[PDB]
Amino acid sequence: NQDVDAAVRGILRNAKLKPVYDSLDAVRRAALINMVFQMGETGVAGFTNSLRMLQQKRWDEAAVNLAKSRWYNQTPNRAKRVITTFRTGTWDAYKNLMDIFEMLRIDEGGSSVYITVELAIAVLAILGNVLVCWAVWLNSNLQNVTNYFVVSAAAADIAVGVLAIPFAITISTGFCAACHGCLFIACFVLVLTQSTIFSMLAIAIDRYIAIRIPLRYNGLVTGTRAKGIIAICWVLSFAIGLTPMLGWNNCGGCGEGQVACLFEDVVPMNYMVYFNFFACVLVPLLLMMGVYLRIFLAARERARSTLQKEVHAAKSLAIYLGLFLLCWLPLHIINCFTFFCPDCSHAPLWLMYLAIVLSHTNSVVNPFIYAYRIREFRQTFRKII
Numbered sequence: 001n002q003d004v005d006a007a008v009r010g011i012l013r014n015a016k017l018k019p020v021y022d023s024l025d026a027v028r029r030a031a032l033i034n035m036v037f038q039m040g041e042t043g044v045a046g047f048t049n050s051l052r053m054l055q056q057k058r059w060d061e062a063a064v065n066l067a068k069s070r071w072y073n074q075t076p077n078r079a080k081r082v083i084t085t086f087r088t089g090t091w092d093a094y095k096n097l098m099d100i101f102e103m104l105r106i107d108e109g110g111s112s113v114y115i116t117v118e119l120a121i122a123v124l125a126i127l128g129n130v131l132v133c134w135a136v137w138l139n140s141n142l143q144n145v146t147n148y149f150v151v152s153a154a155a156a157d158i159a160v161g162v163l164a165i166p167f168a169i170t171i172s173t174g175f176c177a178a179c180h181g182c183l184f185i186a187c188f189v190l191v192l193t194q195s196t197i198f199s200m201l202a203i204a205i206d207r208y209i210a211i212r213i214p215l216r217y218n219g220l221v222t223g224t225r226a227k228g229i230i231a232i233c234w235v236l237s238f239a240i241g242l243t244p245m246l247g248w249n250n251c252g253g254c255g256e257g258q259v260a261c262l263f264e265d266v267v268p269m270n271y272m273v274y275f276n277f278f279a280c281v282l283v284p285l286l287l288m289m290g291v292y293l294r295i296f297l298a299a300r301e302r303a304r305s306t307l308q309k310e311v312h313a314a315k316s317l318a319i320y321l322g323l324f325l326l327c328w329l330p331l332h333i334i335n336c337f338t339f340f341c342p343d344c345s346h347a348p349l350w351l352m353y354l355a356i357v358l359s360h361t362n363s364v365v366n367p368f369i370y371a372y373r374i375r376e377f378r379q380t381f382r383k384i385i
């Protein structure tokens with residue numbers, strides 16, 4: 001409030017800023033005030049090229065140059081909102097959750113509907129996946145090797161419902177927390193959601209061998225081997241989700257040492273796109289889908305029944321993996337747009353939240369559906385109920 005007035009007087013004192021300020025529109029002037037307030041009149045005066053684009057009323061040109069700055073790479077979401085305001089002369093960027101004071105209030109630091117749906121998913125997750133584990137633990141006939149993978153996926157999903165989703169809610173509200181404390185929480189969410197994905201792929205591996213190599217399934221994927229695969233998945237989940245803590249983070253209003261706990265403010269975007277999305281979601285998945293497609297296309301009295309059962313299994317499996325991608329993709333596509341196009345306006349609150357909701361629904365119901373379609377599971381469910 002007091003610093004706002006001082007920032008404007010700082011602009012007036014520097015001959016490199018004052019003429020550029022006068023040239024700006026009422027709204028664009030506030031964007032400059034925000035920028036100066038943040039890094040100082042000397043810092044902003046170092047933007048000789050972008051200042052000349054603003055002075056020449058080349059708005060979109062100024063946006064391009066500002067988005068290439070050290071400023072943008074330091075705090076890209078705040079820089080993006082200031083840049084959008086400089087380009088359009090509107091508060092489009094500040095539409096969710098007008099004057100320079102309110103702009104600074106937002107940057108320094110619907111929601112109820114999001115939290116409600118998120119907790120509804122958390123509850124459903126726990127109930128459904130615990131039921132699945134009870135069926136296998138109670139009913140002796142369900143304690144086979146395949147169900148080691150089913151139960152493993154289910155258990156991970158229970159932990160997602162209890163911990164990960166509540167933590168993900170925190171991560172999107174922006175309360176003031178120590179930067180590294182907020183980084184740890186984000187990593188914990190990344191580990192548990194990573195585990196879901198890997199567990200479903202482990203299930204896919206098990207089924208693939210069971211339908212394509214039925215003559216060696218018992219003699220190839222043992223209880224021991226299965227436990228090994230599951231352990232490996234968890235090792236990878238921790239390794240990946242905790243990677244940011246090893247150095248790949250964004251921090252190498254309310255108080256010193258505390259920051260607004262927001263996912264994108266502490267977790268790097270190149271990490272999420274290049275490493276997490278492409279290598280730990282897309283390639284693993286698409287490869288598995290491709291395998292199923294080839295088994296299906298190759299496939300297409302007792303020798304006949306044995307084949308029809310594998311053509312059906314191939315279609316069912318393809319549909320499951322397709323659904324998985326349809327729910328995980330929206331979120332990662334939004335992330336890609338934000339990362340590849342720094343000039344572009346950020347996705348709106350309702351859209352970002354919608355994508356998160358979708359991904360979390362899939363992250364908890366993958367095991368249950370598979371189990372519900374099995375006759376032995378369904379009847380056992382009723383007997384518990």
Ligand SMILES: CCNC(=O)[C@H]1O[C@@H](n2cnc3c(N)nc(NCCc4ccc(CCC(=O)O)cc4)nc32)[C@H](O)[C@@H]1O
Pocket residue numbers: 077081093168171172189190193194197262263264272276331335346347348349352356359360
């Ligand atoms: C297996 C990998 N795990 C994941 O994908 C998990 O991470 C989380 N997540 C993956 N991207 C993201 C992501 N961009 N933002 C968030 N929250 C914060 C939402 C948010 C961001 C920016 C703004 C500013 C808007 C503006 O300037 O006008 C507002 C809200 N969580 C993610 C999900 O919970 C998923 O389950």
